C-alpha cells in the first residue's frame, strides 16, 4: 500500500504474535465455485461440407474451494511487510512496505509437506528459529510448486522427475548451511503418532495419512517409475472440525472438495549428535501447526501507526 522510503525496521518471526493469534482463531471455510467451460464442435453433414459449428456450455461439477483469510491490523495499528525477496525472518529489513492486511492465506492443516502455500520469489529458501538446535523445525520454501494428485480412492501421485529435482535444490541449500562438502541424507520419519509419521493433511473434514517414505529416502552428493504413488488412509476427525462457541462448522462432504494440491514447502527436522561428521540426516517433521503459520507469516510484523 505505502512503501516506506529509506526506513528500516526490526523483524523477529519467532516472536510474532500474529502467528499465535492466527493459530488459535482461524478456520478453513469453503465456498462453492463454478468453473464453466464451453465446447464447440463442427457439424459435418456430407463431404467437406462442415459449414456450421455448435457452441455449447460445459463443466457443471460444483466443487468447494478454500476461502483466503487475511489478517488485518487492528484499529490504530498497521502491518510492516518485508519485500526483501530472500529474507530470513530475524534482522533489519532495508526494504519495507506498510499494508493494512496480510496476503491471502488458505489454512491447510498438515505435517511434512506444506500445501497451497506461497512460493519463494527468487531461489529456494530454508528457515529455522535456530539452525544449531536440531529440535527446532526447519522450514523449506520451494520457488517452484510440485503438483500432487490425491484421489479418495486412497493414494497420491507425484511426478518423480519433479520431486527428484526439488530434492536436489533442497539438499544443495542445506549443504550450503551445514558445510559445503557434506553428504545430505533424507530418511523416513524416526517414528511416532500417525499424524507425524505419515504425510498427514486435511481435505475438509476428511484426513489423509500418506506413506511419504518414498519421498524421503535418498542420499545426496555421494560420489523406478516415472511417477511416485503414495499409499493413503482416509479418516474423518470431528474433533478437528471448526468449533466457534456453540456452533460447529461441518466442512463440505467429499467428492465435494477437491483433494490434491501444490507442494510449496516442507517441514524437515535434523538428526543431531553423532551425525556431525561427513553427512547430515534430515527427516520429515512438523505436526506443530505454529511452524506452518510461520511459513507464511515470516515477513509480517504488527506495529502502532505513529
Amino acid at each position, epitope marked *: 500500500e505505502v512503501v516506506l522510503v529509506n526506513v528500516t525496521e526490526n523483524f523477529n518471526w519467532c516472536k510474532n504474535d500474529m502467528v499465535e493469534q492466527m493459530h488459535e482463531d482461524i478456520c478453513s471455510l469453503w465456498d462453492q465455485s463454478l468453473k464453466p467451460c464451453v465446447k464447440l464442435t463442427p457439424l459435418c453433414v456430407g463431404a467437406g461440407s462442415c459449414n456450421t459449428s455448435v457452441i455449447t456450455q460445459a463443466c457443471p461439477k460444483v466443487s468447494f474451494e478454500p476461502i483466503p483469510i487475511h489478517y488485518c491490523a487492528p484499529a490504530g495499528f498497521a502491518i510492516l511487510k518485508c519485500n526483501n525477496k530472500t529474507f530470513n525472518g530475524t534482522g533489519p529489513c532495508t526494504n519495507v512496505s506498510t499494508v493494512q492486511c496480510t496476503h491471502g492465506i488458505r489454512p491447510v492443516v498438515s505435517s511434512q509437506l506444506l500445501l497451497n502455500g506461497s512460493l519463494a520469489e527468487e531461489e529456494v529458501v530454508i528457515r529455522s528459529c535456530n539452525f544449531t538446535d536440531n*529440535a527446532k523445525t526447519i522450514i523449506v520454501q520451494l520457488n517452484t510448486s510440485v503438483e500432487i494428485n490425491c484421489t479418495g480412492a486412497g493414494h497420491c501421485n507425484i511426478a518423480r522427475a519433479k520431486w527428484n529435482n526439488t530434492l536436489k535444490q533442497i539438499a544443495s541449500k542445506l549443504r550450503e548451511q551445514f558445510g559445503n562438502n557434506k553428504t545430505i541424507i533424507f530418511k523416513q520419519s*524416526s*517414528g*511416532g*503418532d*500417525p*499424524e*507425524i*509419521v*505419515t504425510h498427514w493433511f486435511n481435505c475438509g473434514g476428511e484426513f489423509f*495419512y500418506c506413506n511419504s517414505t518414498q519421498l524421503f529416502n535418498s542420499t545426496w552428493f555421494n560420489s523406478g517409475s516415472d511417477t511416485i504413488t503414495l499409499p493413503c*488412509r482416509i*479418516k474423518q476427525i470431528i*474433533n478437528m472440525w471448526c468449533k466457534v462457541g456453540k456452533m460447529m462448522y461441518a466442512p463440505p462432504i467429499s467428492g465435494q472438495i477437491r483433494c490434491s494440491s501444490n507442494i510449496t514447502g516442507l517441514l524437515l*527436522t535434523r538428526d543431531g549428535g553423532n551425525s556431525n561428521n561427513e553427512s547430515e540426516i534430515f527427516r520429515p517433521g512438523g*505436526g*506443530d501447526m505454529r511452524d506452518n503459520w510461520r511459513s507464511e507469516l515470516y515477513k509480517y510484523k504488527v506495529v502502532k501507526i505513529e
Partner: antibody, heavy 128, light 109 residues
Framework: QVQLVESGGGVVQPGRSLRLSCAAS????????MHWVRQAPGKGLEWVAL????????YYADSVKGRFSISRDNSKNTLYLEMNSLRAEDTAVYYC?????????????????????WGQGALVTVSS | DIQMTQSPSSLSASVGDRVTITCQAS??????LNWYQQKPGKAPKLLIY???NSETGVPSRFSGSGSGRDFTFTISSLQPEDVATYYC??????????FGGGTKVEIKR
C-alpha cells in the same frame, strides 16, 4: 538411550492430591503418545490414561474419569499426571510408557498402538 | 470397552518345554494385540506387538499368532529366566484392557 524416569512418588492422605512427572529422554518426546499405567501392590496391570503427541486429545479410564488429569510440556520433555481425591484403592505403582509409533507392520490408523518402553515406576501410597 | 480372557491363569512347566498362552477377546479386534512380560519386581516389557511381531532385542524364542478374537503367545523352549507374569493388551479401542493378573508361568525343576 530411551529412558522414562518417574518422579514424585511418596505418601498422600485420603482426599488430598498429588502430581507425578516423567522425565523422558532419548527420543523425540513431542512425537509420541504417552501412557499412564498403575499396578495395585500384588495385582495386575490397569491402564489409567493416555495423551496424544500435541497434548490435545486425552483419554481416560472409567476408573478415574473426573479425578485424574494427564498433561505434558513438550518443551521440558516431561509428562504429568495430577490426581485428586485419592482413595485407599489408588495406592499403587505408577508407570509411564511410550506408545509404539506407527510401524509399517500396522496398516490402519488407531487411537493408540500400545506401550513399548515403560518407566521404572513410582510408588504412591494413600495413607494417613 | 473390550473384555480380555487369558488361559491358563497359572501354569507350571519344566525348562526346555513349550508354553502356550491363549488370549480371547469379547469382540473382533483384527490383529491389534500386544503381549507383555513382567518379571518379579521389574517393570513390564514389550515382547510381541500387533498379534505376531517380535520387538527388536526380544529373544528369538518368543512368538505370537492369531487374529479376530483368538490369539496365542508361545515360548518355544522355556528358559530359567522366562519365569514371569504375562499380559495381553488390545488397542482396537480405548480404554485399553488386559486380563487382570494375566498368566503366571513358573518353572518345575
Amino acid at each position: 538411550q530411551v529412558q522414562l524416569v518417574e518422579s514424585g512418588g511418596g505418601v498422600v492422605q485420603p482426599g488430598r492430591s498429588l502430581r507425578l512427572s516423567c522425565a523422558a529422554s532419548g527420543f523425540t518426546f513431542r512425537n509420541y503418545a504417552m501412557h499412564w499405567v498403575r499396578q495395585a501392590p500384588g495385582k495386575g496391570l490397569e491402564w489409567v490414561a493416555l495423551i496424544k503427541y500435541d497434548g490435545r486429545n486425552k483419554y481416560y479410564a472409567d476408573s478415574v474419569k473426573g479425578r485424574f488429569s494427564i498433561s505434558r510440556d513438550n518443551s521440558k520433555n516431561t509428562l504429568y499426571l495430577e490426581m485428586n481425591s485419592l482413595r485407599a484403592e489408588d495406592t499403587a505403582v505408577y508407570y509411564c510408557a511410550r506408545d509404539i509409533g506407527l510401524k509399517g507392520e500396522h496398516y490402519d490408523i488407531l487411537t493408540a498402538y500400545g506401550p513399548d518402553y515403560w518407566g521404572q515406576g513410582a510408588l504412591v501410597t494413600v495413607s494417613s | 470397552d473390550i473384555q480380555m480372557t487369558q488361559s491358563p491363569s497359572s501354569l507350571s512347566a519344566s525348562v526346555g518345554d513349550r508354553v502356550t498362552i491363549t488370549c480371547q477377546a469379547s469382540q473382533d479386534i483384527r490383529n491389534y494385540l500386544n503381549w507383555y512380560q513382567q518379571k518379579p519386581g521389574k517393570a513390564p516389557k514389550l515382547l510381541i506387538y500387533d498379534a505376531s511381531n517380535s520387538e527388536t532385542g526380544v529373544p528369538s524364542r518368543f512368538s505370537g499368532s492369531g487374529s479376530g478374537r483368538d490369539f496365542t503367545f508361545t515360548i518355544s523352549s522355556l528358559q530359567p529366566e522366562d519365569v514371569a507374569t504375562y499380559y495381553c493388551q488390545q488397542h482396537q479401542n480405548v480404554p485399553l484392557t488386559t486380563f487382570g493378573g494375566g498368566t503366571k508361568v513358573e518353572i518345575k525343576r
